[PDB]
Scaffold this active site. Sequence first.
Site, short mmCIF file in Angstrom:
data_model
loop_
_atom_site.label_atom_id
_atom_site.label_comp_id
_atom_site.label_asym_id
_atom_site.label_seq_id
_atom_site.Cartn_x
_atom_site.Cartn_y
_atom_site.Cartn_z
N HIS A 79 0.82 -1.21 0.00
CA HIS A 79 0.00 0.00 0.00
C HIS A 79 0.85 1.26 0.00
O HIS A 79 1.73 1.44 0.85
CB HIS A 79 -0.96 -0.01 1.19
N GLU A 135 1.64 3.78 3.18
CA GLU A 135 2.20 3.21 4.41
C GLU A 135 3.73 3.30 4.42
O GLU A 135 4.44 2.29 4.45
CB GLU A 135 1.69 1.79 4.60
N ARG A 178 -3.66 4.78 -1.75
CA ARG A 178 -3.52 3.39 -1.27
C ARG A 178 -3.21 2.39 -2.38
O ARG A 178 -2.29 1.56 -2.25
CB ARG A 178 -4.82 2.98 -0.55
N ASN A 226 -3.85 -5.89 -2.02
CA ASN A 226 -4.14 -6.78 -0.91
C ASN A 226 -5.60 -7.29 -0.87
O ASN A 226 -6.06 -7.84 0.13
CB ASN A 226 -3.73 -6.13 0.42
N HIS A 264 2.92 -3.65 6.83
CA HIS A 264 1.90 -2.63 6.58
C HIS A 264 1.88 -1.63 7.73
O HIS A 264 2.69 -1.73 8.64
CB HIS A 264 0.53 -3.30 6.49
N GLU A 311 1.12 -4.79 11.12
CA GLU A 311 0.67 -3.41 10.96
C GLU A 311 1.43 -2.61 11.99
O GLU A 311 1.23 -2.80 13.19
CB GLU A 311 -0.85 -3.25 11.21
C1 LIG Z 1 -9.92 1.71 3.25
C2 LIG Z 1 -10.35 1.19 4.65
C3 LIG Z 1 -11.63 1.95 5.08
C4 LIG Z 1 -10.53 -0.34 4.75
C5 LIG Z 1 -10.78 -0.57 6.25
C6 LIG Z 1 -9.95 0.55 6.90
C7 LIG Z 1 -9.22 1.21 5.70
C8 LIG Z 1 -8.63 2.59 6.07
C9 LIG Z 1 -8.20 0.24 5.05
N1 LIG Z 1 -7.24 -0.29 6.04
C10 LIG Z 1 -6.03 0.26 6.24
O1 LIG Z 1 -5.58 1.24 5.65
C11 LIG Z 1 -5.21 -0.44 7.32
C12 LIG Z 1 -4.95 0.53 8.50
C13 LIG Z 1 -6.26 0.94 9.21
C14 LIG Z 1 -6.84 -0.27 9.95
C15 LIG Z 1 -8.11 0.11 10.73
C16 LIG Z 1 -7.85 1.30 11.67
C17 LIG Z 1 -7.22 2.51 10.98
C18 LIG Z 1 -5.97 2.11 10.17
N2 LIG Z 1 -3.90 -0.79 6.77
S1 LIG Z 1 -3.75 -2.09 5.79
O2 LIG Z 1 -4.45 -1.86 4.49
O3 LIG Z 1 -2.28 -2.26 5.59
N3 LIG Z 1 -4.44 -3.35 6.55
C19 LIG Z 1 -4.44 -4.58 5.72
C20 LIG Z 1 -4.76 -5.77 6.62
C21 LIG Z 1 -4.90 -7.06 5.81
C22 LIG Z 1 -4.69 -8.30 6.67
C23 LIG Z 1 -5.00 -9.59 5.90
N4 LIG Z 1 -4.22 -9.65 4.64
C24 LIG Z 1 -5.48 -4.50 4.59
O4 LIG Z 1 -6.63 -4.11 4.87
O5 LIG Z 1 -5.09 -4.86 3.45
C25 LIG Z 1 -9.11 -0.88 4.49
ZN LIG Z 2 -1.17 -2.04 3.93
#
Ligand SMILES: CC1(C)[C@@H]2CC[C@@]1(C)[C@@H](NC(=O)[C@H](CC1CCCCC1)NS(=O)(=O)N[C@@H](CCCCN)C(=O)O)C2
Ligand SMILES: [Zn+2]
Length: 305
Positions: free
Chosen positions: A64, A67, A122, A139, A192, A266
Amino acid sequence: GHSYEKYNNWETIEAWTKQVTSENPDLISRTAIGTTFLGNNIYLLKVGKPGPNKPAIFMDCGIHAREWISHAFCQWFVREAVLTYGYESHMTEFLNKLDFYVLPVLNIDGYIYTWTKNRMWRKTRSTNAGTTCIGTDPNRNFDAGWCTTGASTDPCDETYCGSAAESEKETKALADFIRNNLSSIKAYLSIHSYSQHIVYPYSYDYKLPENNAELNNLAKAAVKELATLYGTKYTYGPGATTLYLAPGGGDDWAYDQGIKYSFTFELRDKGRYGFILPESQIQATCEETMLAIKYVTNYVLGHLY
Ligand SMILES: CC1(C)[C@@H]2CC[C@@]1(C)[C@@H](NC(=O)[C@H](CC1CCCCC1)NS(=O)(=O)N[C@@H](CCCCN)C(=O)O)C2
Ligand SMILES: [Zn+2]
Ligand SMILES: [Zn+2]
Ligand SMILES: [Zn+2]
């Protein structure tokens, strides 16, 4: 000018992949595993003392774009490998016995875009049919419960799953590499931010993995090790239980390929700065993360399969 304690733009990271390899030819080799949508080479560093029939751990950063601490961490990991091989017992054992495939920036096109146009971007930078909305979430683009709930079918959405699994050149390049080296790869680690979590499968559905107890215990221990340095508090668990449904992830895909040690980290923080983590925190964040990564690495070495 590259610095491990600042965020480096793509041109600088790219130049670094070349320079760190040339400076450390008996510990690092560089390959390009594919190209991005915009034609940028996707570089992979193989870190370790060459030897026959070595097991490996695969680690990616920068899936992403926004990040930035993730990108900084892969660089830090390589920094630590070259600095402490020969000087610290554990890193020495690790590089002798295992190879690390470190992919410092997967989503290069998106990373460039966060430097030039939109710090909060992103996704990838690929085009989509029937709309001017750009990009796919890599992802949500792997072939693991692909495009079920927790991914979006809307190309204008931040979790867009793409037109098909592995539709993105970047996703396909990573998956092809892992498929080509599957018999050697024993762990998959994806870096991440933010929110301070260690996640393991599954995220594409509410289900627990075959080795749930083992992964629970290992994540618990890694979180404990991480906290020893500065008292930074991480939580952990299966992705769908701890975080949210997020189908099409590299970690679940790698796990279902048989890589039974598969984790998403994360990193800092918990929302004060979020993705815009100050450069002043790079050192501390990377150093404590090193402790978790080394703990997992040591465990894998002790439980080869
Ligand atoms: C666009 C969104 C609304 C949707 C839900 C919240 C978002 C902001 C986004 N999530 C992120 O940006 C998170 C950081 C945020 C987590 C929740 C609290 C605030 C921060 N980072 S991430 O994308 O690297 N998380 C990985 C986990 C995947 C693990 C299994 N593969 C991933 O989702 O690929 C996805
Ligand atoms: Zn990420
Ligand atoms: Zn250090
Ligand atoms: Zn054991």
